[PDB]
Amino acid sequence: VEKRASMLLFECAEMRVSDLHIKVYDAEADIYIRKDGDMELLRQIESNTAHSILASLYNNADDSDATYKINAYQAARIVASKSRLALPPVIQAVRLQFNPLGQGGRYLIARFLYTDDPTRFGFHHSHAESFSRMRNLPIGINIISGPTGSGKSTTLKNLLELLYIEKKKKVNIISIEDPPEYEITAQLPTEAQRGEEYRKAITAALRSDPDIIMPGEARDAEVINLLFTAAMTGHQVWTSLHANNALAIFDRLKDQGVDEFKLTDPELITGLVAQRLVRKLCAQCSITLTEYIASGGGISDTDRKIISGHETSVRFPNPRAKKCCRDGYNGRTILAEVIEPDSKLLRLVAEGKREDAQHYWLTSLHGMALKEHAWLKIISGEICVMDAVNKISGIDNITEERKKYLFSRDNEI
Amino acid sequence: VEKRASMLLFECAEMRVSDLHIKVYDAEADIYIRKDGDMELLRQIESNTAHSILASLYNNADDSDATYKINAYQAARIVASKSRLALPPVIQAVRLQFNPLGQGGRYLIARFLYTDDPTRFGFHHSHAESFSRMRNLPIGINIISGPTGSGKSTTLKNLLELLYIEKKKKVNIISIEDPPEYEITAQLPTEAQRGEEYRKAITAALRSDPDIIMPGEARDAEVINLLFTAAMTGHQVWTSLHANNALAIFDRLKDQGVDEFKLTDPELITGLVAQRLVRKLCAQCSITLTEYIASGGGISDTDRKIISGHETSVRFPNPRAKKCCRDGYNGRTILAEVIEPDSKLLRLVAEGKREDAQHYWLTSLHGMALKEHAWLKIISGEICVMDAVNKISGIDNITEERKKYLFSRDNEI
Ligand SMILES: Nc1ncnc2c1ncn2[C@@H]1O[C@H](COP(=O)(O)OP(=O)(O)NP(=O)(O)O)[C@@H](O)[C@H]1O
Ligand SMILES: Nc1ncnc2c1ncn2[C@@H]1O[C@H](COP(=O)(O)OP(=O)(O)NP(=O)(O)O)[C@@H](O)[C@H]1O
Ligand SMILES: [Zn+2]
Ligand SMILES: [Zn+2]
């Protein structure tokens, strides 16, 4: 039924979920939504209605092979301005993935791409200073790394507005994003055809005077090679990648053929940012450790080790669903690490040491990693310890001297 | 005759054997079964009846070339829900391998794939702690290694239930197993076609949001490359491999093209497990060393060296087939080694030293190898020394200081 699918899509748009999952078990079908970073169960619908709405979603999808193919895997895309499903204006495009499940079952995954203050989202002040210093440099390449729900596009858009303000419209800015998402310059619009179109758009942007290229993501190795050659040509590149800890970026680049002599130059690789998104506790409804352990308190030994020393400072989510917010959580915040490479740091990284290179960054360069930022926001009470240790590993490995140094540097500023 | 083959399959299912071997010598045919880890002789059947039942098994098999091909090698598969042989519900699929044997003889091998408490199967407490620590980490790749009868699928299923309990259904779990074996998430279902289907299923699982990928085995190099790229993308992988001693995993990976820069990072390779299955003595019927040597005692010099120091503690199988159990053995237990890699350990392994790297793991990392666990279960009396030295080599090479340290660490806990 088209109507039930339309109501489901409107409900998911108004509730602002990220992904939608539908699992059919031939008795009852589970409908799950991905709100913020955690998954939750939406509904237990009937199997026949779920099969009907999945069939309708496949039929009104733009890509279809005229076979439902219960036993076979399928992919499809629904694009706005041509849709009999009467899509809401909030959702621009929906990417549907259909998978077989057991015997006569279906698994539908929907990505729900959306078509929709100047600074200090969740970053530290040192990260803001590094961002300003990186924006002041005319020549270089910047790479943003993290998992899928990092929010790299929002950071790139905010940096683009900051470049608008700072540069006084004296430079040319080009933006090459195949899916138009959010206001952002010249917005330049199967998988192989999309990749070929993206490569053609990048080449056409390079034929003109790009100054700042601002590419969208980096899937292919040829794309990254073209971006690197344009960066050594004399332009500025702000790209995004999938990596961890702001040092696996080099591992993700050497896998595709960037070669070691390009990554050694500190003038080329201007900055590296690795960020993650975690849920933020509501400020109106927060409880102390004693109030948390008073009613159903569950704390592990590592969590107790992290809290120890600042037991009164930490905060926990408040149950009972008070008037403010929804469930004691108010949005999300970014924990990030920003590195400005040096000659010695890049020389140590290129040798593949992986030891005394992170130490050099933390001690000599006065750098801060993602674990220290997560611990600082744990002590400040902005985020819960359980969410931080679920998202990030290694928080309990911070030494006492490092914690004392971080507290001293936070108090002296 | 279909009836005799049906009775043979029912007998093998009720007796719970692993593999079935039929050898034809044109005078009398040997029927052998693989119960637990050891092979034994089931029956001495007539050659004509064996040829007839093998011909019937080939004819009712799904794959057939309409030629019996006595002189040629053949392979076939029998799948449930489409079988004129009236398969028992316990057996899902049977893989038949037919080989020539001498002049006019046949060799049939049947794998007998079966379609069918929360922790502490045979693992040590340190292994359980390492398992919990590995389950707490959000990003990484875990590899389970061992011979064919290790029981890696059972360990992976138990870890999946433990992840169900721990994660509180806040993450998405996908399972990609081409043969559906045992309850386990979204269960995603010639050799080249099967490999292509497996690769397509893995790609389709990667197109959605996998979080935890949980792949089934690793046959091809492209599959392992895709798993590694997904692990550096930011997902978690629990895969199984065929290797020994938890350090030949790197040798099995470098053979297929993982490259050295991917294996150096300790944040990527989160843990390595190598396990084996040995027979456990029945607790009701156990005899001491004196009772064993009283009647038909056969002990070697190396076995005497291993037993020496704890002669009264060891136990031996009890003959005469008492009321309990079957032959003095009660099930099987796992002897395993679990390593959490470090930067120095991975640097030493990547250099190909093979010396002072195992020493670093045993001394600095306080690790325990499979030989020490086997010796500890020998001293505790859970398993027999002969089975342990048949399954595992190098038990007699443990020094006296290491044995004293193991006994002290077992007594202090
Ligand atoms: N402080 C915040 N910073 C960034 N994003 C936030 C923040 N708070 C909430 N969000 C939301 O987090 C969501 C993730 O942003 P998004 O740019 O879509 O991630 P992404 O890296 O582009 N995902 P993908 O393209 O699939 O790899 C955004 O839609 C934000 O609305
Ligand atoms: N403590 C135990 N732990 C694991 N398996 C056990 C144990 N006790 C008995 N078993 C049985 O050992 C058998 C081997 O398990 P299995 O998962 O089939 O090994 P495998 O590694 O998957 N073999 P293969 O796929 O051919 O490489 C299982 O069927 C168990 O029933
Ligand atoms: Zn609130
Ligand atoms: Zn017994």
Tab-separated table of N, CA, C and O in Angstrom, chain A residues 247 250 254 263-264 342-361 364:
chain	number	residue	atom	x	y	z
A	247	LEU	N	45.647	9.265	12.378
A	247	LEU	CA	46.902	8.709	11.897
A	247	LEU	C	46.713	7.533	10.955
A	247	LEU	O	47.641	7.214	10.203
A	250	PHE	N	46.942	8.084	6.805
A	250	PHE	CA	48.077	7.681	5.982
A	250	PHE	C	47.989	6.215	5.581
A	250	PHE	O	48.402	5.852	4.474
A	254	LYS	N	48.021	5.212	1.685
A	254	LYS	CA	49.039	4.334	1.120
A	254	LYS	C	48.445	3.073	0.509
A	254	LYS	O	49.090	2.446	-0.337
A	263	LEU	N	53.532	12.161	0.901
A	263	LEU	CA	53.068	12.332	2.271
A	263	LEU	C	54.141	12.868	3.211
A	263	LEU	O	53.817	13.226	4.348
A	264	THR	N	55.399	12.925	2.775
A	264	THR	CA	56.475	13.373	3.653
A	264	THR	C	56.486	14.889	3.825
A	264	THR	O	56.859	15.384	4.895
A	342	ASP	N	54.267	18.076	11.240
A	342	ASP	CA	55.604	18.646	11.229
A	342	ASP	C	56.512	17.740	10.405
A	342	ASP	O	56.121	16.645	9.994
A	343	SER	N	57.732	18.216	10.147
A	343	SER	CA	58.688	17.422	9.380
A	343	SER	C	59.080	16.154	10.130
A	343	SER	O	59.115	15.062	9.552
A	344	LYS	N	59.370	16.283	11.428
A	344	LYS	CA	59.766	15.123	12.221
A	344	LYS	C	58.612	14.142	12.390
A	344	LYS	O	58.813	12.924	12.319
A	345	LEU	N	57.398	14.655	12.615
A	345	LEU	CA	56.237	13.782	12.772
A	345	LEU	C	55.954	12.999	11.497
A	345	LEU	O	55.702	11.788	11.546
A	346	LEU	N	56.004	13.668	10.343
A	346	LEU	CA	55.766	12.976	9.082
A	346	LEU	C	56.896	12.013	8.745
A	346	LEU	O	56.649	10.959	8.146
A	347	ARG	N	58.134	12.351	9.115
A	347	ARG	CA	59.243	11.422	8.918
A	347	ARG	C	59.074	10.172	9.773
A	347	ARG	O	59.354	9.058	9.314
A	348	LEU	N	58.624	10.336	11.020
A	348	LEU	CA	58.401	9.184	11.888
A	348	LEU	C	57.226	8.342	11.406
A	348	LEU	O	57.261	7.110	11.499
A	349	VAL	N	56.175	8.988	10.899
A	349	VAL	CA	55.013	8.252	10.406
A	349	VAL	C	55.362	7.485	9.134
A	349	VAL	O	54.967	6.324	8.966
A	350	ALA	N	56.122	8.111	8.229
A	350	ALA	CA	56.462	7.471	6.961
A	350	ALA	C	57.357	6.253	7.155
A	350	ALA	O	57.355	5.346	6.314
A	351	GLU	N	58.122	6.209	8.245
A	351	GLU	CA	58.942	5.045	8.550
A	351	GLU	C	58.137	3.888	9.126
A	351	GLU	O	58.688	2.794	9.290
A	352	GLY	N	56.859	4.098	9.434
A	352	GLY	CA	56.033	3.035	9.971
A	352	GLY	C	56.363	2.647	11.393
A	352	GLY	O	56.154	1.493	11.778
A	353	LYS	N	56.887	3.584	12.188
A	353	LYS	CA	57.264	3.268	13.561
A	353	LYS	C	56.039	3.002	14.428
A	353	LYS	O	56.000	2.015	15.173
A	354	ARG	N	55.049	3.904	14.375
A	354	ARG	CA	53.817	3.879	15.169
A	354	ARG	C	54.085	4.025	16.666
A	354	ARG	O	53.153	3.981	17.475
A	355	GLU	N	55.349	4.205	17.039
A	355	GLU	CA	55.761	4.452	18.411
A	355	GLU	C	56.787	5.574	18.390
A	355	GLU	O	57.577	5.685	17.447
A	356	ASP	N	56.742	6.422	19.418
A	356	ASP	CA	57.497	7.670	19.530
A	356	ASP	C	57.133	8.680	18.446
A	356	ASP	O	57.803	9.712	18.316
A	357	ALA	N	56.090	8.409	17.661
A	357	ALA	CA	55.489	9.373	16.750
A	357	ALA	C	54.220	9.973	17.337
A	357	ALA	O	54.021	11.190	17.281
A	358	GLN	N	53.351	9.129	17.897
A	358	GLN	CA	52.251	9.631	18.711
A	358	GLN	C	52.777	10.297	19.976
A	358	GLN	O	52.220	11.300	20.437
A	359	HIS	N	53.849	9.747	20.553
A	359	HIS	CA	54.486	10.374	21.707
A	359	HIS	C	55.063	11.737	21.345
A	359	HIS	O	54.973	12.687	22.132
A	360	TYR	N	55.671	11.847	20.160
A	360	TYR	CA	56.187	13.132	19.696
A	360	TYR	C	55.063	14.144	19.510
A	360	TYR	O	55.218	15.324	19.844
A	361	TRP	N	53.928	13.700	18.966
A	361	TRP	CA	52.788	14.591	18.777
A	361	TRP	C	52.197	15.034	20.111
A	361	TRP	O	51.824	16.201	20.273
A	364	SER	N	55.921	16.833	22.327
A	364	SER	CA	56.642	17.948	21.720
A	364	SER	C	55.695	18.923	21.031
A	364	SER	O	55.872	20.143	21.133
